[PDB]
Amino acid sequence: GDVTVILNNLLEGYDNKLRPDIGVKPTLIHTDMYVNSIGPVNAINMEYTIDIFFAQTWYDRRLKFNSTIKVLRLNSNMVGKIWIPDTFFRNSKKADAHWITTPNRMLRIWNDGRVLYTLRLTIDAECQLQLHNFPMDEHSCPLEFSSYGYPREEIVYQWKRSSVEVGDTRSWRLYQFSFVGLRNTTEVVKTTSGDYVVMSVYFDLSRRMGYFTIQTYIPCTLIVVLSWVSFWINKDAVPARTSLGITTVLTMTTLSTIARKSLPKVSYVTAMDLFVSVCFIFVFSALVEYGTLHYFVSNRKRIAKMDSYARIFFPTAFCLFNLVYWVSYLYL
């Protein structure tokens, strides 16, 4: 066949160990990316999964051919025969290509020696998360790549127009986050080997607060109201009010322990920790209030009217704290 002899002529005397234009000029690679989905964001390990179709285009004079055929469209078989860029992802903890039913690779060669090489990838990429404003936090997770062995004098990357494409985000696996947008950048990084062109894509994510509202805030508020209920019980019923106070304190301790299970073991205070601590302070103050009331009314012998003052003071103070907290965090 004509195509068979064309391929045999192209591969005759071809050295895949040498990049095109070696010793002449840098090889310019044009990069393109289609994001199938952004997997879950694992805050404990500070990483996220992403599935992409990654495409690279470059010119190779050794692969020029003359015929009526304009394009040779080839499967994964010939990928190992020609020179391929050694692109790798800088911030990748774990990555893998897809191999079922066959290697998910595509090659296309033009008359003028232009080569397009595409493959499907699944990448776990580290994303350092600053959880100070958790669960009202927003993040900008990167994905960086470059050539492993060729410095900028040998390989240069370029993005093309409208480089990064995304499908329908409704089918993505982002439960706790909503995809805001993305941006692309290119820079140069210096290492002991030399200077390398690094190409980065930043994805902006904003956390969704519904799950933590269901899980943490509402139970804490309800337990605080349960502690408030003690003020209307008669002061003579010592076991009942003592039981209310101790049960509220223990439940708040348990909720505080449970709330931080989702986070990593960071050594700073988050917004959730502040809210839970303030709820703990409120219930502890209610129990101490009853303790001093009982001590003054009976054990020793305005003070007797402490319950009436508490009924007004505690709910108003809690409402003021909630207003200040939410206004400070959500808006400012």
Partner: protein, 344 residues
């Protein structure tokens, strides 16, 4: 001219015996090493190991790979590394490791005119690190990576840190959630096995644990229940149900906190600092409950006897309650002072 480079490389690879090291019968080959640390993750006390990602680079000289006429450092496709001799370096304390392989094998081979070879790999390795948790969570750990030649003795190969103390970089940029890297060290020595002496390099880090997480999680709740246990001293002596319920709840909460805290660690046989603190808090709350029990006994089981017959005095419940009010906070504060002075 690509043809000249192709002929030069083909000449270099022709007649090359990969089975023999450089200077097979001659003096040992010197191999310089350097590392660029990318990240340290998952410092696990349960598994007693840590994960480490790095760019590991080796430098040596091979006379057989010397060329001339090309004033360039030829960077070649990494597959040619399969056709050249490379050192048989390995890590002794490694448990699981791999070379990253997307889009291709993250491997670099670079030649120079004088036969010098630079060989770089991108490696993620889970290295073992046995930890002494006696002072946990106020403990400092030392975690090391050993680098050694497997088959070649000191007569055949020599290792050195390329660049002296600057051979390892990127340590200052590392950020761990629970630790801070206070120091790192580089050591070069020899180790003797039954098969002979081999060269060894060692890269050690010292990690100091952050205390804020445990203050938020463990110490402050324990102090809070311990303070709550003292409320019983202000309750009337005849309100037995309230005081007993308070004491029992405090004791059970302390026990549950201790158990659920210890359940998230390896089954070590010795006691930790936090275990000592929790045991002290348990003793305090238990003594408060026993104090109420003593007050109730001294009142009810001894009032009739005193009536028939006829530190503070051991016959007045109010005196005992006042003494407990004075003494329990003071003793707890003294215990905290001693504990925090000893461990810090």
């Amino acid at each position: 001219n690509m043809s000249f480079v192709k002929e030069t490389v083909d000449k270099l690879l022709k007649g090359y015996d990969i089975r023999l090291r450089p200077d097979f019968g001659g003096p040992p080959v010197c191999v310089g090493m350097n590392i660029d640390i990318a990240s340290i993750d998952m410092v696990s006390e349960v598994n007693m190991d840590y994960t480490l990602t790095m760019y590991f680079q080796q430098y040596w000289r091979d006379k057989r790979l010397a060329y001339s006429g090309i004033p360039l450092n030829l960077t070649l496709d990494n597959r040619v590394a399969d056709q050249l001799w490379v050192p048989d370096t390995y890590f002794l304390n490694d448990k699981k490791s791999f070379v990253h392989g997307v889009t291709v094998k993250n491997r670099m081979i670079r030649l120079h005119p004088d036969g010098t070879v630079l060989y770089g790999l991108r490696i993620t390795t889970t290295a073992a690190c046995m930890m002494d948790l006696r002072r946990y969570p106020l403990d400092e750990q030392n975690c090391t990576l050993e680098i050694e030649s497997y088959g070649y003795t000191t007569d055949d190969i020599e290792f050195y840190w390329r660049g002296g103390d600057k051979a390892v970089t990127g340590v200052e940029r590392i950020e761990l959630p629970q630790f801070s890297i206070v120091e790192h060290r580089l050591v070069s020595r020899n180790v003797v096995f039954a098969t002979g002496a081999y060269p060894r390099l060692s890269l050690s880090f010292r990690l100091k644990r952050n205390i804020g997480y445990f203050i938020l999680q463990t110490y402050m709740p324990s102090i809070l229940i311990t303070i709550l246990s003292w409320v019983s001293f202000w309750i009337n002596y005849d309100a037995s149900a309230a005081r007993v319920a308070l004491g029992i709840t405090t004791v059970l909460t302390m026990t549950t906190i201790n158990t659920h805290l210890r359940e998230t660690l390896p089954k070590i046989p010795y006691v930790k600092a936090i275990d000592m603190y929790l045991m002290g808090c348990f003793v305090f709350v238990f003594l408060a409950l026993l104090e109420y029990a003593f007050v109730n006994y001294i009142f009810f089981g001894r009032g009739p006897q005193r009536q028939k017959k006829l530190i503070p005095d051991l016959t007045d419940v109010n005196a005992i309650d006042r003494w407990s009010r004075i003494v329990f906070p003071f003793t707890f504060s003294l215990f905290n002072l001693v504990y925090w002075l000893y461990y810090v």
